[PDB]
Design a binder for this molecule. Structure first.
Ligand code: MG
Ligand code: MG
Ligand code: MG
Ligand code: MG
Ligand code: MG
Ligand code: MG
Ligand code: MG
Ligand code: MG
Ligand code: MG
Lengths: 51, 190, 213, 55, 110, 256, 214
RNA sequence: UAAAUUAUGGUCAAUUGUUAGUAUUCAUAUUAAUUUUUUUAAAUGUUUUAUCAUUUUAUAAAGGUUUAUUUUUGAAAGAUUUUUUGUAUAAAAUUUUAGGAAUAGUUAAUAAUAAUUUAUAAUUUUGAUUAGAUUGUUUUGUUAAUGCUAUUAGAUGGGUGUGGAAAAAUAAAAAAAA
């Protein structure tokens, strides 16, 4: 039985996004430069008149 | 429906309620080996194939799978697996090139235990610090030459004995006494 | 544009500072030759392959990467095309234009460029072989052309090379010069096989800045 | 154990599995696991003066 | 030792049988060993292993055209220099030279 | 046919050229590995760089470790001179006489008015800094270039008592430039690169000699080993070349 | 009362070893003592290799006094190439024991984490040079390479026709040949490796799929 | 080095052969399969266009690969009046044969070098290269269960190199500019 009565009650006691844990993701220095640039030029404009 | 018996089947086109839609691959085929060669003459010097050969990789019993958790991932946070390696410098015959022996890990889930294997890398040291028998930190990088993707990031332990040994004009390390094994008997006297 | 004078003025004010301690080279990193990606990318010398949020002190540039333009005649299958090839040196800041000619001659790897004497010029005006880049205000951004001996004869049919499409190539000239190297007579692997652009590529009128129809 | 792998007997399968066993793997101490005996007594009559550059 | 101590598995008895082999089994295998060895003797087998050659592959000298026992079967093909040297070895093995150590002799060695 | 189809050393993108240019308009050709040729190969070394205002004025005095008599260094540099002069005798004016060989620990500008206050005060601070330091055994091998290949020197390897030097120097650096404001051509919070200057091209010389020392001369001695020396003697020197035949010495300290 | 310390151990085992050696020289077969000599030699090997990471000068003068360098020689090329000879002082726990600061100023041994630049880079920037003493190989290779551009400048100044000949050949070569443009296929650093499936039939240039570590 | 309770919580592990003195997973069992059955596939002509041309239409032929296969936006999506950017081709792990030996347009530095640049080079017994078999790292069957036992198929070099990308010579079942 896969129904709702099979799981415990405690799944619905939870606040949102509290299952998340702190994620340390590092990456190459080169890739930081690439990514920061990308986000910058995306913040300026993502699309031509469409922004 | 894989959970229904041979006789219980009605339609083969759909799952009525839920579950996994499963194709049966026929595992027992009685596959056989064809023998095309005489036991005397087999057309290979080092190895002979007389039976059905097990195939695949990771489909291979007993399963040997990549183990991310070892010393290297213990110390480092790697952006990509194998982006950092700690090893020893073995030989420098090539300018601005340090060969490095490194250990990594394999897991056998059948026996629940790990093995350490070893692998050589070419690392790029500009400025030629590394003396044979250094403990070095090594990183993934730009493609440099045909075989060098790694560069020497830091010397953890230098070889002080080896350096002083060089300063005196001697080789860093004595050259190994015997080379690779042979199947012959070399009679060389005096 | 705005960048050039913003950074020029910035440098010039930086030099007039009475009080400055000088930079700490442990805090002023160099550049890396080691970064992800297969290609090796050459950047500006103010720029780095990593992320550096802080603006570094303006430095005078002791090696100025000049670009010098030439006209080549590129063989394409239909006939000859006249196009542009840049040669890029690094010429020391205070160098003399004679020395720039010399550096340019050494750096070109194409057999078809430096055959005769050439004169450097900017917007059609010749430069003194005698004086400095400083005087002529030559920077990276400045547009420098190069003019060969016979180039003012190119409007004729002589100096301009002759394509085997419309012209006889004879045993006289089969053994001489780009014709010889080219191997006009087709081989099985087709010889050096040059780029080709067809006849109707630009229409009946060739390429232009101005729309002619 | 499927009967087609390795020899016609069963025990041939487990004899080639000992080649993959984790605690049996080749290292600086245990070497030449698969042919020990071709390399045996190979250098007996090979006389090599050991390497000394230091007095 | 080079040759085989046993032929086939001579210790097969039930577990904890408190001897390496029973009398019965050991007698069977003694029979088989006997037959093989007798075959080696009468056919006049000779093997050789030469230095700077693959060792596991042994030149069978008893099949060499000069030393071959049969008048019929095609013997074997071995290098002319090497085969001359093998013939000389087999020949000068035969008799005891004084000062040399006494080594066992037989009819079938020739 | 004898290697990779596209040799890896030849794959180069120039990002200091505008985007789209190389695809359509024109192609740019350059020998790109003269520039990429590194700091180990060229033999350059990055010295503490002066702020512009300090860069304007000539240096007057410098700190030096005085080389003793009977050096491995002096001997081998003499041997090197012999070899160089036999190869190319155009070097002759470039070379520094073996009599003037000394280790340069830092350079400084002293104005001529405050001269005595500064020399006394410096000398004193120097004596306090080096009070505890016993003699220094340092190793010399390798050559390097300052000021765009105009200055050619012998490197001091950080393999030995060098470590101590670095603290020692960085102390006087924080006294002479930190405490009493004096012009050290760099920042007092930065360490100077110690060196033995071998060949040099001065401003006047530059016309007849050329703008850079050709690397063809010293290429072979680039990594040559000049040996070890123990040093007990620190000087503060003003640069006058005719007073004693050695740099005129305004102050001295003995390491013992 | 020191016994168990490395220097002491190494010396006593060195002596024991010499004794047993000359003993075997006299009376040839006692294989008991051959075995004891071999075991002693092994424990000596341990003691010495721990010494050079404890204090190396004493290690040196022991080797020079008793003339044992023959048991410090790595046994065979195979296990050496895998770096299990250097792996010993890892197991002994002396690998990090150096205490640099007396030797080898640590400032240029480390790489920059945020910058990504190697140790040779931060050494470059601090104006320091770590370089191992070079043999004549590396010296004459480097001193041959340093001069390429001067030789070239002299060549293309003084002798333009020869140059233009060579250039003709190169330029025209670029249009002939196997691949004219760089794509994943052409720009594969290891061609025979990534396409092994071509090696017997189509591609005849290479007879083996592996020429390097990988 | 002490127990515990405010009491079944956090959602099911559960094993079925009638043998023949004894030792050893081995004939006859169930489940899963092949033996075994025509209730799911399918036919040729792709299509516009400015006319002998030029626009649109990019991975099912075979060969047998185990240190092996890796990539962009310049096409379309796509929106403004014109010059518009940077990031990519690289790697790490997992790799088969009962009885085992050497491999090779070859490593690394130089550089848009060198069919004769420089060097004490590179791969291998921690199992190489040839050679056999084999379509690689979410798919199955059995089972209470660490196991054992399956998984197709699809990327096969270059030679006027077009195209954003070679994936480009029957074999759809992808609506392809009203
Ligand atoms: Mg008997
Ligand atoms: Mg007797
Ligand atoms: Mg590769
Ligand atoms: Mg093949
Ligand atoms: Mg296909
Ligand atoms: Mg194969
Ligand atoms: Mg891999
Ligand atoms: Mg790869
Ligand atoms: Mg073809």
């Amino acid at each position: 039985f896969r129904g709702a009565d099979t799981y415990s009650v405690k799944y619905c006691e939870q606040g949102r996004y509290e299952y998340q844990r702190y994620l340390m993701i590092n990456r190459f220095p080169s890739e930081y430069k690439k990514h920061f640039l990308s986000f910058l030029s995306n913040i300026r404009m993502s699309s031509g008149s469409a922004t | 429906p894989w959970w229904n018996f041979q006789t219980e089947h009605r339609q083969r086109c759909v799952l009525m309620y839920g579950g996994a839609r499963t194709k049966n691959t026929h595992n027992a085929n009685h596959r056989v080996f064809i023998k095309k060669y005489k036991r005397n003459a087999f057309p290979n010097r080092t190895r002979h194939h007389w039976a059905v050969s097990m195939t695949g990789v990771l489909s291979q019993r007993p399963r040997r799978m990549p183990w991310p958790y070892d010393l290297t991932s213990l110390i480092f946070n790697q952006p990509r697996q194998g982006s950092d390696k700690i090893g020893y410098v073995v030989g420098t015959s090539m300018l601005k090139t340090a060969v490095v022996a490194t250990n990594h890990m394999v897991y056998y889930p059948k026996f629940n235990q790990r093995v350490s294997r070893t692998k050589r890398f070419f690392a790029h040291d500009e400025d030629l610090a590394c003396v044979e028998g250094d403990l070095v930190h090594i990183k993934q990088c730009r493609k440099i030459s045909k075989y060098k993707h790694y560069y020497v990031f830091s010397i953890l332990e230098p070889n002080v004995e080896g350096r002083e040994r060089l300063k005196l004009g001697l080789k860093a390390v004595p050259p190994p006494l015997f080379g690779y094994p042979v199947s012959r008997r070399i009679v060389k006297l005096n | 544009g705005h960048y050039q004078q913003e950074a020029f003025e910035a440098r010039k004010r930086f030099e007039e500072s009475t009080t400055y301690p000088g930079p700490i080279r442990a805090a002023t990193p160099g550049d890396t030759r080691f970064y992800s990606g297969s290609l090796e990318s050459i950047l500006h010398d103010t720029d780095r392959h990593y992320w550096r949020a802080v603006t570094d002190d303006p430095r005078v540039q002791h090696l100025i990467p000049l670009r010098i333009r030439f006209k080549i005649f590129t063989w394409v299958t239909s006939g000859w095309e006249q196009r542009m090839q840049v040669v890029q040196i690094m010429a020391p800041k205070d160098s003399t234009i004679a020395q720039v000619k010399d550096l340019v001659i050494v750096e070109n790897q194409s057999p078809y460029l430096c055959v005769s004497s050439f004169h450097l010029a900017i917007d059609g005006k010749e430069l003194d072989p005698q004086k400095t880049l400083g005087e002529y205000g030559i920077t990276e951004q400045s547009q420098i052309d190069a003019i060969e001996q016979n180039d003012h004869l190119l409007h004729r049919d002589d100096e301009r090379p002759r394509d085997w499409t419309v012209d006889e190539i004879t045993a006289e000239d089969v053994k001489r010069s780009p014709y010889k190297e080219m191997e006009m007579q087709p081989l099985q692997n087709l010889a050096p096989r040059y780029e080709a652009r067809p006849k109707g590529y630009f229409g009946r009128t060739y390429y232009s800045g101005m729309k002619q129809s | 154990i499927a009967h087609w792998y390795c020899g016609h007997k069963f025990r041939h399968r487990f004899m080639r599995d000992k080649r993959f066993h984790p605690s049996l793997q080749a290292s600086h101490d245990a070497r030449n696991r698969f042919s020990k005996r071709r390399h045996f007594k190979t250098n007996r009559w090979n006389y090599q003066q050991a390497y000394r550059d230091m007095p | 030792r080079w040759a085989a101590k046993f032929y086939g598995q001579v210790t097969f008895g039930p577990r904890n049988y408190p001897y390496p082999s029973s009398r019965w089994l050991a007698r069977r295998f003694q029979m088989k060993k006997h037959r093989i060895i007798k075959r080696f003797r009468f056919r006049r087998y000779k093997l050789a292993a030469v230095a700077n050659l693959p060792f596991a592959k042994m030149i069978r000298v008893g099949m060499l055209p000069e030393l071959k026992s049969s008048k019929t079967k095609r013997g074997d093909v071995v290098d002319p220099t090497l085969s001359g040297q093998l013939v000389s070895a087999v020949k000068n093995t035969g008799e005891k030279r004084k000062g040399q150590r006494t080594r066992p002799k037989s009819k079938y060695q020739v | 046919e004898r290697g990779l189809y596209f040799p890896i050393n030849h794959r180069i993108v120039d990002h200091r050229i505008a985007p789209g240019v190389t695809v359509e308009e024109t192609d740019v050709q350059s020998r790109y590995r003269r520039e990429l040729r590194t700091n180990f190969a060229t033999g350059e070394t990055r010295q503490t760089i002066a702020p512009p205002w300090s860069a304007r004025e000539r240096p007057t005095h410098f700190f030096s470790l005085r080389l003793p008599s009977r050096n491995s260094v002096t001997l081998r540099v003499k041997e090197m001179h012999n070899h160089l002069l036999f190869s190319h005798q155009q070097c002759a004016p470039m070379l520094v006489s073996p009599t003037k060989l000394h280790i340069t620990l830092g350079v400084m500008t002293i104005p001529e008015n405050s001269r005595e206050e500064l020399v006394k005060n410096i000398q004193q601070s120097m004596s306090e800094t080096f009070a505890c330091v016993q003699p220094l055994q340092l190793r010399f091998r390798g050559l390097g270039t300052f000021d765009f290949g105009r200055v050619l020197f012998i490197r001091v390897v950080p393999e030995a008592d060098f470590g101590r030097l670095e603290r020692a120097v960085c102390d006087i650096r924080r006294r002479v430039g930190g405490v009493l404001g004096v012009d050290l051509k760099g920042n007092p919070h930065d360490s100077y690169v110690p060196h033995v200057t071998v060949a040099k091209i001065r401003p006047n010389q530059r016309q007849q000699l050329g703008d850079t020392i050709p690397q063809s001369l010293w290429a072979d001695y680039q990594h040559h080993d000049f040996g070890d020396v123990t040093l007990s003697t620190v000087d503060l020197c003003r640069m006058k070349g005719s007073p004693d035949g050695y740099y005129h010495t305004e102050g001295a300290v003995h390491l013992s | 009362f020191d016994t168990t310390s490395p220097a002491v151990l190494a010396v006593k085992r060195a002596l024991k070893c010499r004794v047993l050696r000359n003993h075997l020289l006299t009376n040839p077969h006692n294989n008991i003592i051959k075995t004891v000599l071999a075991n002693t030699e092994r424990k000596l090997n341990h003691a010495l290799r721990r010494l050079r990471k404890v204090d190396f000068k004493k290690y040196w003068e022991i080797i020079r006094d008793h003339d044992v360098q023959d048991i410090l020689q790595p046994p065979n090329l195979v296990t050496y190439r895998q770096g299990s000879y250097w792996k010993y002082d890892w197991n002994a726990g002396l690998a990090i024991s150096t205490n640099l600061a007396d030797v080898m100023d640590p400032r240029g041994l480390n790489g920059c984490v945020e910058t990504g630049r190697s140790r040779s880079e931060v050494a470059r920037d601090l104006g320091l040079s770590y370089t191992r003493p070079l043999h004549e190989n590396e010296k004459k290779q480097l001193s041959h390479q340093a001069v390429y551009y001067e030789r070239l400048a002299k060549f293309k100044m003084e002798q333009p026709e020869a140059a233009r000949a060579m250039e003709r050949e190169r330029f025209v070569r670029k249009f002939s040949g196997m691949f004219v443009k760089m794509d994943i296929r052409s720009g594969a650093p290891d061609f025979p490796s990534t396409y092994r499936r071509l090696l017997g039939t189509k591609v005849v240039r290479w007879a083996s799929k592996r020429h390097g570590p990988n």
